[PDB]
Ligand binder design. Structure first.
Ligand code: D4Z
Length: 269
Protein backbone atom coordinates (compact mmCIF):
# COMPACT_ATOMS: atom_id res chain seq x y z
CA UNK A 1 0.00 0.00 0.00
CA UNK A 2 2.88 2.41 0.93
CA UNK A 3 4.74 2.34 -2.52
CA UNK A 4 1.31 2.35 -4.32
CA UNK A 5 0.17 5.54 -2.47
CA UNK A 6 3.58 7.21 -3.21
CA UNK A 7 2.76 6.98 -6.97
CA UNK A 8 -1.07 6.99 -6.84
CA UNK A 9 -3.23 9.73 -5.38
CA UNK A 10 -6.35 8.36 -3.55
CA UNK A 11 -8.31 11.41 -4.69
CA UNK A 12 -11.68 10.71 -3.05
CA UNK A 13 -14.23 8.13 -1.88
CA UNK A 14 -16.46 6.81 -4.65
CA UNK A 15 -18.67 4.72 -2.40
CA UNK A 16 -19.13 3.10 1.00
CA UNK A 17 -20.32 -0.34 2.10
CA UNK A 18 -20.26 -2.73 5.09
CA UNK A 19 -16.93 -4.13 3.68
CA UNK A 20 -15.34 -0.65 3.77
CA UNK A 21 -15.02 1.88 0.93
CA UNK A 22 -14.12 2.35 -2.76
CA UNK A 23 -11.54 5.06 -3.53
CA UNK A 24 -10.62 6.75 -6.81
CA UNK A 25 -6.83 6.24 -7.33
CA UNK A 26 -5.05 8.35 -9.97
CA UNK A 27 -1.43 7.67 -10.98
CA UNK A 28 0.57 10.97 -10.58
CA UNK A 29 2.68 10.33 -13.72
CA UNK A 30 0.28 8.65 -16.24
CA UNK A 31 -3.03 10.03 -14.82
CA UNK A 32 -4.55 6.52 -15.20
CA UNK A 33 -7.55 6.10 -12.86
CA UNK A 34 -8.41 2.84 -11.01
CA UNK A 35 -11.18 2.13 -8.44
CA UNK A 36 -9.70 0.63 -5.25
CA UNK A 37 -12.07 -1.32 -2.99
CA UNK A 38 -10.61 -1.32 0.56
CA UNK A 39 -11.93 -4.06 2.89
CA UNK A 40 -11.05 -4.43 6.62
CA UNK A 41 -11.25 -8.22 7.16
CA UNK A 42 -11.53 -7.57 10.96
CA UNK A 43 -15.23 -6.50 10.45
CA UNK A 44 -16.21 -10.28 10.33
CA UNK A 45 -14.57 -13.71 11.13
CA UNK A 46 -16.03 -15.12 7.84
CA UNK A 47 -14.64 -12.08 5.87
CA UNK A 48 -11.28 -13.75 4.71
CA UNK A 49 -13.31 -16.64 3.09
CA UNK A 50 -16.02 -14.10 1.92
CA UNK A 51 -13.53 -11.76 0.16
CA UNK A 52 -11.66 -14.87 -1.17
CA UNK A 53 -15.01 -15.82 -2.86
CA UNK A 54 -15.57 -12.27 -4.30
CA UNK A 55 -11.90 -12.35 -5.53
CA UNK A 56 -12.39 -15.90 -6.94
CA UNK A 57 -15.64 -14.93 -8.73
CA UNK A 58 -14.04 -11.67 -10.02
CA UNK A 59 -11.18 -13.75 -11.56
CA UNK A 60 -13.75 -15.66 -13.71
CA UNK A 61 -15.30 -12.50 -15.22
CA UNK A 62 -14.59 -11.17 -18.71
CA UNK A 63 -17.46 -9.29 -20.35
CA UNK A 64 -18.17 -5.78 -21.78
CA UNK A 65 -21.11 -5.32 -19.29
CA UNK A 66 -19.25 -6.41 -16.11
CA UNK A 67 -16.76 -4.19 -14.13
CA UNK A 68 -13.22 -5.41 -14.98
CA UNK A 69 -11.13 -6.90 -12.09
CA UNK A 70 -7.36 -6.13 -12.31
CA UNK A 71 -6.08 -7.84 -9.22
CA UNK A 72 -5.82 -7.65 -5.46
CA UNK A 73 -3.44 -7.63 -2.52
CA UNK A 74 -3.58 -8.11 1.23
CA UNK A 75 -1.78 -5.68 3.63
CA UNK A 76 -2.11 -7.02 7.17
CA UNK A 77 -5.87 -7.35 7.87
CA UNK A 78 -6.77 -5.06 4.93
CA UNK A 79 -7.68 -6.38 1.44
CA UNK A 80 -7.31 -4.15 -1.65
CA UNK A 81 -9.29 -5.01 -4.85
CA UNK A 82 -8.28 -3.12 -8.01
CA UNK A 83 -11.17 -2.47 -10.36
CA UNK A 84 -12.03 -0.65 -13.56
CA UNK A 85 -12.99 2.94 -12.71
CA UNK A 86 -16.49 3.49 -14.17
CA UNK A 87 -16.49 7.24 -14.69
CA UNK A 88 -20.24 7.42 -15.56
CA UNK A 89 -21.06 6.61 -11.92
CA UNK A 90 -24.03 4.56 -10.63
CA UNK A 91 -27.19 3.90 -12.69
CA UNK A 92 -28.99 5.03 -9.46
CA UNK A 93 -28.01 8.70 -10.14
CA UNK A 94 -29.48 8.53 -13.68
CA UNK A 95 -32.88 7.92 -12.06
CA UNK A 96 -34.82 11.10 -11.27
CA UNK A 97 -36.80 10.48 -7.97
CA UNK A 98 -40.55 9.79 -8.72
CA UNK A 99 -39.91 10.32 -12.47
CA UNK A 100 -37.32 7.80 -13.70
CA UNK A 101 -35.68 8.48 -17.06
CA UNK A 102 -36.73 8.63 -20.78
CA UNK A 103 -38.08 5.26 -22.03
CA UNK A 104 -35.33 4.80 -24.77
CA UNK A 105 -32.56 5.24 -22.10
CA UNK A 106 -34.32 2.72 -19.78
CA UNK A 107 -34.61 0.27 -22.75
CA UNK A 108 -30.92 0.57 -23.75
CA UNK A 109 -29.75 0.11 -20.11
CA UNK A 110 -32.10 -2.88 -19.75
CA UNK A 111 -30.66 -4.52 -22.93
CA UNK A 112 -27.10 -4.07 -21.49
CA UNK A 113 -28.27 -5.36 -18.06
CA UNK A 114 -29.66 -8.51 -19.85
CA UNK A 115 -26.35 -9.00 -21.79
CA UNK A 116 -24.40 -8.87 -18.51
CA UNK A 117 -26.85 -11.16 -16.66
CA UNK A 118 -26.92 -13.69 -19.57
CA UNK A 119 -23.12 -13.78 -19.43
CA UNK A 120 -22.98 -14.38 -15.62
CA UNK A 121 -25.70 -17.08 -15.79
CA UNK A 122 -23.94 -18.76 -18.75
CA UNK A 123 -20.79 -19.23 -16.60
CA UNK A 124 -22.98 -20.44 -13.66
CA UNK A 125 -22.71 -17.26 -11.54
CA UNK A 126 -25.68 -15.53 -9.86
CA UNK A 127 -25.20 -11.91 -8.65
CA UNK A 128 -27.97 -11.90 -5.96
CA UNK A 129 -27.78 -8.12 -5.41
CA UNK A 130 -28.85 -6.51 -8.70
CA UNK A 131 -30.02 -2.94 -8.01
CA UNK A 132 -29.21 0.52 -9.50
CA UNK A 133 -26.46 1.15 -6.88
CA UNK A 134 -24.58 -1.98 -8.24
CA UNK A 135 -24.89 -1.09 -11.95
CA UNK A 136 -22.19 1.38 -13.00
CA UNK A 137 -21.61 3.35 -16.18
CA UNK A 138 -18.41 3.82 -18.12
CA UNK A 139 -17.36 7.00 -20.02
CA UNK A 140 -19.72 6.00 -22.95
CA UNK A 141 -22.77 5.25 -20.64
CA UNK A 142 -22.30 1.47 -21.10
CA UNK A 143 -23.75 -0.42 -18.11
CA UNK A 144 -21.36 -2.57 -16.04
CA UNK A 145 -22.52 -5.03 -13.37
CA UNK A 146 -20.58 -4.32 -10.17
CA UNK A 147 -20.25 -5.49 -6.48
CA UNK A 148 -19.84 -9.31 -6.51
CA UNK A 149 -19.63 -9.64 -2.68
CA UNK A 150 -22.89 -11.64 -2.59
CA UNK A 151 -22.33 -13.53 -5.86
CA UNK A 152 -22.12 -17.34 -5.84
CA UNK A 153 -21.87 -20.36 -8.15
CA UNK A 154 -25.24 -22.02 -8.90
CA UNK A 155 -24.14 -24.38 -11.72
CA UNK A 156 -21.01 -26.64 -11.69
CA UNK A 157 -20.27 -27.60 -15.29
CA UNK A 158 -23.80 -28.66 -16.48
CA UNK A 159 -25.23 -29.39 -12.97
CA UNK A 160 -27.43 -26.88 -11.19
CA UNK A 161 -27.78 -26.61 -7.40
CA UNK A 162 -30.55 -24.82 -5.49
CA UNK A 163 -29.71 -21.82 -3.29
CA UNK A 164 -31.03 -21.06 0.20
CA UNK A 165 -29.41 -17.77 1.33
CA UNK A 166 -31.71 -14.83 2.11
CA UNK A 167 -29.52 -12.43 0.23
CA UNK A 168 -29.71 -8.92 -1.00
CA UNK A 169 -31.67 -5.72 -0.65
CA UNK A 170 -35.25 -6.50 0.50
CA UNK A 171 -37.21 -4.19 -2.03
CA UNK A 172 -35.31 -6.07 -4.80
CA UNK A 173 -35.67 -9.67 -3.49
CA UNK A 174 -37.94 -12.22 -5.23
CA UNK A 175 -40.91 -13.50 -3.09
CA UNK A 176 -39.63 -17.14 -3.06
CA UNK A 177 -36.77 -15.92 -0.72
CA UNK A 178 -39.48 -15.36 1.97
CA UNK A 179 -41.52 -18.49 1.04
CA UNK A 180 -39.24 -21.39 0.05
CA UNK A 181 -36.36 -22.98 1.94
CA UNK A 182 -34.51 -23.60 -1.35
CA UNK A 183 -34.97 -22.06 -4.81
CA UNK A 184 -33.55 -21.66 -8.30
CA UNK A 185 -30.90 -18.89 -8.70
CA UNK A 186 -31.76 -17.52 -12.16
CA UNK A 187 -35.41 -16.39 -11.49
CA UNK A 188 -34.16 -14.38 -8.41
CA UNK A 189 -31.78 -12.24 -10.61
CA UNK A 190 -34.60 -11.96 -13.26
CA UNK A 191 -36.98 -10.57 -10.58
CA UNK A 192 -34.40 -7.95 -9.37
CA UNK A 193 -33.89 -6.86 -13.04
CA UNK A 194 -37.67 -6.24 -13.20
CA UNK A 195 -37.39 -4.07 -10.05
CA UNK A 196 -34.47 -2.15 -11.65
CA UNK A 197 -36.63 -1.67 -14.83
CA UNK A 198 -39.57 -0.39 -12.67
CA UNK A 199 -37.18 2.13 -10.95
CA UNK A 200 -35.71 3.31 -14.31
CA UNK A 201 -39.24 3.93 -15.75
CA UNK A 202 -41.01 5.48 -12.71
CA UNK A 203 -38.25 6.64 -10.29
CA UNK A 204 -39.93 4.70 -7.51
CA UNK A 205 -39.67 1.22 -5.88
CA UNK A 206 -43.11 -0.49 -5.82
CA UNK A 207 -42.90 -2.06 -2.32
CA UNK A 208 -40.81 -2.48 0.88
CA UNK A 209 -41.01 -6.27 0.31
CA UNK A 210 -42.96 -8.79 -1.81
CA UNK A 211 -45.05 -10.22 1.10
CA UNK A 212 -48.89 -10.63 1.17
CA UNK A 213 -48.67 -8.51 4.39
CA UNK A 214 -47.28 -5.64 2.20
CA UNK A 215 -50.32 -3.71 0.82
CA UNK A 216 -48.37 -2.39 -2.22
CA UNK A 217 -47.40 -5.94 -3.18
CA UNK A 218 -51.07 -7.07 -2.77
CA UNK A 219 -52.13 -4.15 -5.04
CA UNK A 220 -49.74 -5.41 -7.80
CA UNK A 221 -50.97 -9.04 -7.41
CA UNK A 222 -54.49 -7.55 -7.81
CA UNK A 223 -53.43 -5.79 -11.09
CA UNK A 224 -54.03 -2.26 -9.65
CA UNK A 225 -51.79 -0.62 -12.29
CA UNK A 226 -53.80 2.65 -12.00
CA UNK A 227 -51.75 3.19 -8.76
CA UNK A 228 -48.15 4.43 -8.45
CA UNK A 229 -45.56 3.52 -9.66
CA UNK A 230 -47.41 1.53 -12.38
CA UNK A 231 -49.70 4.37 -13.63
CA UNK A 232 -46.54 6.31 -14.77
CA UNK A 233 -45.48 3.28 -16.89
CA UNK A 234 -46.64 2.91 -20.51
CA UNK A 235 -48.58 -0.33 -21.36
CA UNK A 236 -45.80 -1.80 -23.55
CA UNK A 237 -42.99 -1.90 -20.80
CA UNK A 238 -45.70 -2.69 -18.14
CA UNK A 239 -46.66 -5.86 -20.10
CA UNK A 240 -43.01 -6.99 -19.77
CA UNK A 241 -43.07 -6.11 -16.01
CA UNK A 242 -46.30 -8.22 -15.67
CA UNK A 243 -44.28 -11.24 -17.02
CA UNK A 244 -41.13 -10.58 -14.88
CA UNK A 245 -42.82 -9.74 -11.56
CA UNK A 246 -44.65 -13.12 -11.38
CA UNK A 247 -44.83 -14.53 -7.82
CA UNK A 248 -44.33 -18.22 -8.74
CA UNK A 249 -40.65 -18.44 -9.95
CA UNK A 250 -41.44 -21.49 -12.16
CA UNK A 251 -44.05 -19.40 -14.11
CA UNK A 252 -41.75 -16.30 -14.25
CA UNK A 253 -40.40 -15.21 -17.68
CA UNK A 254 -36.85 -16.49 -18.48
CA UNK A 255 -34.26 -14.23 -20.22
CA UNK A 256 -34.62 -16.13 -23.60
CA UNK A 257 -38.35 -15.15 -23.46
CA UNK A 258 -37.62 -11.54 -22.29
CA UNK A 259 -35.67 -11.31 -25.61
CA UNK A 260 -38.95 -12.09 -27.49
CA UNK A 261 -40.92 -9.36 -25.64
CA UNK A 262 -42.59 -6.65 -27.82
CA UNK A 263 -41.38 -3.69 -25.74
CA UNK A 264 -37.88 -5.22 -25.44
CA UNK A 265 -37.73 -5.31 -29.29
CA UNK A 266 -39.62 -2.00 -29.79
CA UNK A 267 -37.81 0.70 -31.85
CA UNK A 268 -38.10 3.88 -29.76
CA UNK A 269 -37.30 7.55 -30.72
N1 D4Z B 1 -15.50 0.54 -10.05
C1 D4Z B 1 -15.93 1.77 -9.77
O1 D4Z B 1 -15.67 2.71 -10.54
C2 D4Z B 1 -16.83 1.97 -8.59
C3 D4Z B 1 -17.11 0.91 -7.70
C4 D4Z B 1 -18.05 1.08 -6.67
C5 D4Z B 1 -18.74 2.29 -6.52
N2 D4Z B 1 -19.64 2.49 -5.48
C6 D4Z B 1 -20.20 1.38 -4.70
C7 D4Z B 1 -20.97 1.91 -3.49
C8 D4Z B 1 -21.79 0.78 -2.84
C9 D4Z B 1 -22.82 0.22 -3.83
N3 D4Z B 1 -22.15 -0.16 -5.08
C10 D4Z B 1 -21.23 0.80 -5.70
C11 D4Z B 1 -18.46 3.34 -7.40
C12 D4Z B 1 -19.03 4.64 -7.47
C13 D4Z B 1 -18.33 5.19 -8.53
C14 D4Z B 1 -18.47 6.54 -9.18
C15 D4Z B 1 -17.83 6.84 -10.38
C16 D4Z B 1 -18.01 8.09 -11.00
C17 D4Z B 1 -18.83 9.04 -10.37
C18 D4Z B 1 -19.48 8.74 -9.16
C19 D4Z B 1 -19.30 7.49 -8.56
N4 D4Z B 1 -17.48 4.33 -9.12
C20 D4Z B 1 -17.53 3.17 -8.43
Amino acid sequence: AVPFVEDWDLVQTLGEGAYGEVQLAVNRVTEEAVAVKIVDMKRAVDCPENIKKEICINKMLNHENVVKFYGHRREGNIQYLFLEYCSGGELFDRIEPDIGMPEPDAQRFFHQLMAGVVYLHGIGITHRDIKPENLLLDERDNLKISDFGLATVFRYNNRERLLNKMCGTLPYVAPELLKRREFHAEPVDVWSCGIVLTAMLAGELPWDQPSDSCQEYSDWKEKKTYLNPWKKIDSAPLALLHKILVENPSARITIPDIKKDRWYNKPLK
